[PDB]
């Protein structure tokens, strides 16, 4: 049989019944495995050494010993399971490699870029007034080799993974201090898997590609000893194309515009009112560069003006919802926010009208335009001033957040976003009254090991 032939060549013995049985329907998988030319790759993972890792001890043999074991492993393997981790594993690499770490040793044009050049600093006050007005709360060593490597990849992979966070608005002013660069890609998993390949295959050092379930659709890659390397949160090509986005030297960014949104929604979230005492300054950069940014390109100016911003923000107390008038800027009467993903699916049917949208990890939540209304979720905790009573942070958090959605739909934004940017200026510290808590959300913190062979979900 053509397909015991080809078992029989991959493991390197004759097939247990079980063994046939148990592989069958991967003989098309298995094959272009035992096909796969392993020197031309050797040759890729070599050209990737001394392009990103340079720094290494490592011969072109010890590396291409590694691979060439690994591609054979599957002979001295009898466990079912563990040898379907190693086809697993093998084709992606055999899949997927060339694709996306091996377009990383052809050179690009050396496009003489142009950048703009903003003047982050005549709105470095303004932004330390206004959050201000808010401060009123209570790692592995390859990081910096694989950062390197995104700076690449970021250009060499425009239309699968966009970035966003420090690095992004590092490419906008260049005194933003970056550390990890935040992507979004279609493919989140395929290249964390081939990265963490190159990786254990170079370092020699098995790292664990693992997945949170709190978030949507976050994966990371850790060390043997638990240290962070690089993550990444993976949306639609259906997602990927509404997301705003900029053209920075060959590279995609959000939209700062976008950012600017999502970060005055974070505010709302007391572990970064935290964050903000700590360091107050930390966020002034980032918050300029974006007040900047917005200014200068949609003619955004700040002067403070009246109010209509923040607008109402009802807050049911107990039955955790948030009805919200927008009869002003959108056609659409109200939005209810609820604070329960759960409940928002539950009550979510029992209007049977269904042309929702889901943002992913984007906008953290779904929204659904129905009766002239608007259904969304809140994924952050809700701030009061007083007893039953939503504040200003949280309300203009929650104004963002119905913003974001906005943008990712062309509708109109720029307007509202002004008065939203100015309803920040000049306000008198109000205390925290208390805090809901972010809902419950347990799951599979499965991961993939890199050597030992098991997948946890």
Sequence with gaps: NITLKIIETYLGRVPSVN??????????????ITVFN???????????????????????????????????????????????????????????????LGVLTIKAPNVISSKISYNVTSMEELARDMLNSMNVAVVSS????????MEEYLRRHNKS???????????????????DIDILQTNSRTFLIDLAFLIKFIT????????????????????????????????????????????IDNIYIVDPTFQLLNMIKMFSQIDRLEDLSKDPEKFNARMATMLEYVRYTHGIVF????????????????????????????SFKKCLVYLDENV????????????????????NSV???????????????????????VHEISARGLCAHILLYQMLTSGEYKQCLSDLLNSMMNRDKIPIYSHTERDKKPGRHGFINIEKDIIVF
Excluded: W
């Design 38 to 100: 392993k020197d031309i790759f050797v040759s890729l993972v070599k050209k990737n050494k001394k392009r990103f890792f340079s720094d290494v001890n490592t011969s072109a043999s010890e590396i291409k010993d590694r691979i060439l074991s690994y591609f054979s492993k599957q002979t001295q393997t009898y466990n079912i399971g563990k040898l379907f981790t190693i086809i697993e594993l093998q084709s992606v690499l055999v899949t997927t490699y060339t694709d996306i």
């Design 19 to 32: 063994e046939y049985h148990m592989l069958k329907s991967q003989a098309r998988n298995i094959q272009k």
């Design 344 to 363: 928002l699916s539950s009550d979510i049917l029992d209007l049977n009208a269904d042309t929702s949208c889901d943002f992913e990890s984007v906008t």
């Design 204 to 247: 020699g050092n098995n790292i664990i590609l693992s997945k949170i379930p709190y978030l949507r659709n976050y994966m990371v890659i850790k060390d043997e000893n638990d240290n962070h390397i690089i993550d990444s949160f993976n949306i639609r090509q259906d997602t990927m194309n509404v997301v705003p986005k900029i053209f």
């Design 303 to 330: 002067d403070g003006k009246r109010n209509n911003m923040p607008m109402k923000c009802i807050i049911d107390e107990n039955n955790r919802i948030v009805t919200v008038t927008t009869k002003d800027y959108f």
């Design 367 to 389: 929204y659904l335009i129905h009766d002239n209304i608007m259904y969304t979720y809140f994924s952050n905790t809700i701030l009061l001033s007083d007893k039953g009573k």
């Design 142 to 149: 390859l990081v910096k080799n694989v950062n390197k490597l």
């Design 161 to 179: 993974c966009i970035c966003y966070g420090s690095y992004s608005l590092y490419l906008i002013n260049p005194n933003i201090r970056y550390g």
